[PDB]
Amino acid sequence: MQAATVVINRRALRHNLQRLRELAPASKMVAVVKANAYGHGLLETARTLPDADAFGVARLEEALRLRAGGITKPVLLLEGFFDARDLPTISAQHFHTAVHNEEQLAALEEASLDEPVTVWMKLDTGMHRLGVRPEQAEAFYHRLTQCKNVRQPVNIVSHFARADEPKCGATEKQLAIFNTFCEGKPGQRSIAASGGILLWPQSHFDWVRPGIILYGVSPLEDRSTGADFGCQPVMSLTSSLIAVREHKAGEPVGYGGTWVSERDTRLGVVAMGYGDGYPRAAPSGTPVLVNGREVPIVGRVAMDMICVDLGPQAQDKAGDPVILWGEGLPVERIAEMTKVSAYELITRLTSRVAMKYVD
Amino acid sequence: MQAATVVINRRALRHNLQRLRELAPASKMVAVVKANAYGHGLLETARTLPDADAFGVARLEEALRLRAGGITKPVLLLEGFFDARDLPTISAQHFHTAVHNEEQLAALEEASLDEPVTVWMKLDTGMHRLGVRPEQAEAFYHRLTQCKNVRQPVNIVSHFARADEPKCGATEKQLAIFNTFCEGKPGQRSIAASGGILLWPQSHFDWVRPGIILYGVSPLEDRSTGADFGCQPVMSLTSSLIAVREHKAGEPVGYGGTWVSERDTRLGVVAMGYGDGYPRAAPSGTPVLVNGREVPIVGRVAMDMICVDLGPQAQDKAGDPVILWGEGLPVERIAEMTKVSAYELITRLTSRVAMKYVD
Ligand SMILES: Cc1ncc(COP(=O)(O)O)c(CN[C@H]2CONC2=O)c1O
Ligand SMILES: Cc1ncc(COP(=O)(O)O)c(CN[C@H]2CONC2=O)c1O
């Protein structure tokens, strides 16, 4: 019938972008669409959001697919470029780039481009992933200022490591470091993504980079959902039953006989598995909606199939609609039940699901 | 380009099919290529194995992509068809199909096809996922036998739920049930996949369906690898470093500051994350190969990046080769370290990874 299908709500997506402008009314928006737009579709998510001030990607590849698809809006390379030979491209495509290491800076200093490139110097303010450390930042920053190939002024970007943990002073320390370096400097400032936007109004500055929350999903693991912030869930992972079978008490289900029935019942088989992106870690009891009502997963999640307990006289039939997460079942709820981060749930899906866009 | 790349060894793949024929010398092969050939590529895995007796898929869509790509060899629909209206296509495409429920049988009984379809009746011998239960099997089987649309004789297929657990008598019980039903019946018999092939020579029968082991990966969670059975690993998940940075003692790394360094060291940043398919569940300490030597992951695995500890004077530079798993690092080893099944590791990868084929 219909199998593994990801349904993307274009109206929810536009709503969230506008909703986020209301939360950060003095900041421009970098719609973060990396990793196939967190599973919602790189190009379609961008086509949906022409109001974005820019689009953010992880890799140069992603930026080029945007251009290839007709996106004209500025694209920000959050990780910068990996090869000095890519600068002519980046210049001609009008891609904005982060600059975090000596290789990139030296590259910019000796390249010969027909046009200078807007840059966002990435400062390491405490996460210690990418970026120039405080003691090397000033000298590094000054070189970018002297580059004929760098469009002036140079902008400043950083990222939070624990913005979702308001109780520890990590975020305030990163802000302290961020603010100290930006003092007296021109050029746009940006450090906040979903968590910074929602919980830290002092971190909005000139540009904010909504990612997870843009898709109506919460960046926090406190069982809050996108709706807690007025953002609507964009994605629905759906499928269908391919079988409804009789089952006896005492009989196990699935690999390892992991689950045993204590009653005669009817089981439903869903055309969904980890070969589609659904977490194999999902325990028996995890909720799924069959014909709009919640039923539990029973036994191990397999590569292409998932079994659920329908009840002894259920009436559900093969071909009926199944919702892995969507309307009536937030992905955050799944995240909680399976202990899998919502970020990974919506993002680590395979090419086997169909993509569908509505309204 | 040289970022998230899955390298597929075509020579290892051919070697494993031949190696398996040596283990099951009197059985035909159904090369199971469902779920994008377990992450190795549906069409390319099929193109490199023209010696297979048939190809097995989960869904009808997968079978059609094989035909669309030029594969002419028989394709077995392990889950059968989900819509009675698909029978005319299945007949014309010469797809073999499993039949596990009333819907499919009744569909075959009343459809009008220009040619009959070869069928594999699915018998539920104990896994209780798909298949006709023992008490309903005889009547169900007889109807398929009387179908003008079913090519005679009808074949019989089943699947093991615990073939990897030789201790418990689950597999022997499924065999007992399987053998009892097949007595006196013509038509091919098939119940064994990777585990059955390797550990149960009494389950080989007429056709065996190698899946996991075909890709040189072990179906067991006992630390064994594909090489334990003479099968060579087909896949290599590779990438590159995009940064090598200084780091100080007492400083945390990544989201949640979950790893703290007890020494001044140098960290490497890999262009790999769960947005590519790499498990977010990977703990600090999980091994990765940088320039051929093993280094530990430190801090949470992010969507697009992974940090590793290189050492205080490590000579590694951005752009250097990184191996997530492949030569010198079996996926089974990463399975063990992360507690993620090897099946899911190789299969639940996203479309962001580039596919490369070698000899
Ligand atoms: C630099 C940057 N800006 C914005 C975002 C968007 O964050 P939210 O998703 O939280 O809004 C990310 C997230 N990249 C994250 C996503 O997961 N793993 C990462 O490393 C980021 O790295
Ligand atoms: C019907 C059938 N045949 C063969 C196999 C091959 O198994 P191996 O890889 O073990 O050999 C599977 C596994 N499908 C598995 C994959 O994991 N989940 C499943 O349902 C299967 O369902």
Tab-separated table of N, CA, C and O and ligand atoms in Angstrom, chain A residues 32 34 38 78 129 159 193-194 209-212 343, chain B residues 255 274 302-304, ligand 1:
chain	number	residue	atom	x	y	z
A	32	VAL	N	19.032	26.999	9.421
A	32	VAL	CA	19.976	25.885	9.365
A	32	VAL	C	19.320	24.669	8.716
A	32	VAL	O	18.458	24.016	9.302
A	34	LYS	N	21.240	22.014	7.172
A	34	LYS	CA	22.231	20.961	6.977
A	34	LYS	C	21.676	19.585	7.304
A	34	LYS	O	20.653	19.470	7.977
A	38	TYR	N	17.754	18.444	8.445
A	38	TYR	CA	17.391	17.649	9.620
A	38	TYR	C	16.383	16.558	9.263
A	38	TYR	O	15.531	16.198	10.073
A	78	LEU	N	28.923	26.906	7.865
A	78	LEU	CA	29.192	26.845	9.303
A	78	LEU	C	30.558	26.258	9.696
A	78	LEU	O	31.108	26.618	10.735
A	129	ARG	N	35.264	22.740	20.033
A	129	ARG	CA	35.069	21.867	18.891
A	129	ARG	C	35.828	22.560	17.749
A	129	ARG	O	36.941	22.158	17.415
A	159	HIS	N	29.359	29.165	19.045
A	159	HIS	CA	28.242	28.247	19.283
A	159	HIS	C	28.257	27.740	20.728
A	159	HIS	O	29.326	27.516	21.296
A	193	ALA	N	21.705	29.506	18.549
A	193	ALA	CA	20.971	28.578	17.694
A	193	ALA	C	19.666	28.355	18.456
A	193	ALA	O	19.298	29.194	19.276
A	194	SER	N	18.974	27.241	18.221
A	194	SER	CA	17.698	26.993	18.911
A	194	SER	C	17.670	27.314	20.415
A	194	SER	O	16.867	28.132	20.862
A	209	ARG	N	20.710	31.478	14.596
A	209	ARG	CA	20.731	30.343	13.670
A	209	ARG	C	19.809	29.203	14.078
A	209	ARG	O	20.262	28.158	14.540
A	210	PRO	N	18.498	29.382	13.903
A	210	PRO	CA	17.583	28.305	14.288
A	210	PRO	C	17.742	27.023	13.468
A	210	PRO	O	17.775	27.046	12.238
A	211	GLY	N	17.860	25.905	14.178
A	211	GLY	CA	17.959	24.614	13.531
A	211	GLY	C	16.792	23.735	13.979
A	211	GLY	O	15.698	23.793	13.420
A	212	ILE	N	17.018	22.943	15.021
A	212	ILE	CA	15.997	22.036	15.533
A	212	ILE	C	14.622	22.694	15.719
A	212	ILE	O	13.619	22.185	15.222
A	343	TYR	N	17.105	15.017	17.834
A	343	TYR	CA	17.967	15.480	16.743
A	343	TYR	C	18.299	14.320	15.817
A	343	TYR	O	18.213	14.441	14.596
B	255	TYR	N	28.990	18.916	23.305
B	255	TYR	CA	27.734	19.222	23.992
B	255	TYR	C	27.662	18.555	25.359
B	255	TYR	O	27.984	17.378	25.513
B	274	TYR	N	25.996	11.889	13.106
B	274	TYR	CA	24.808	11.076	12.908
B	274	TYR	C	23.963	11.552	11.716
B	274	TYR	O	23.077	10.835	11.254
B	302	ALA	N	28.249	14.606	17.268
B	302	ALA	CA	27.276	15.602	16.844
B	302	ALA	C	26.718	15.244	15.463
B	302	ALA	O	27.105	14.246	14.857
B	303	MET	N	25.823	16.085	14.960
B	303	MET	CA	25.180	15.848	13.678
B	303	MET	C	26.138	15.767	12.504
B	303	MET	O	25.979	14.903	11.643
B	304	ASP	N	27.132	16.657	12.472
B	304	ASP	CA	28.080	16.699	11.356
B	304	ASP	C	29.547	16.501	11.725
B	304	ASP	O	30.392	16.310	10.851
C	1	LIG	C1	27.098	26.281	14.207
C	1	LIG	C2	25.647	25.928	14.371
C	1	LIG	N1	24.661	26.797	14.259
C	1	LIG	C3	23.454	26.411	14.425
C	1	LIG	C4	23.156	25.099	14.748
C	1	LIG	C5	21.715	24.726	14.938
C	1	LIG	O1	21.380	24.246	16.282
C	1	LIG	P1	20.152	23.855	16.665
C	1	LIG	O2	20.016	22.787	15.989
C	1	LIG	O3	20.415	23.412	17.893
C	1	LIG	O4	19.281	24.871	16.598
C	1	LIG	C6	24.166	24.163	14.853
C	1	LIG	C7	23.788	22.764	15.207
C	1	LIG	N2	24.660	21.704	14.747
C	1	LIG	C8	24.429	20.677	15.731
C	1	LIG	C9	23.262	19.822	15.456
C	1	LIG	O5	23.646	18.623	15.974
C	1	LIG	N3	24.916	18.521	16.045
C	1	LIG	C10	25.483	19.638	15.864
C	1	LIG	O6	26.662	19.760	15.910
C	1	LIG	C11	25.433	24.629	14.671
C	1	LIG	O7	26.506	23.891	14.754
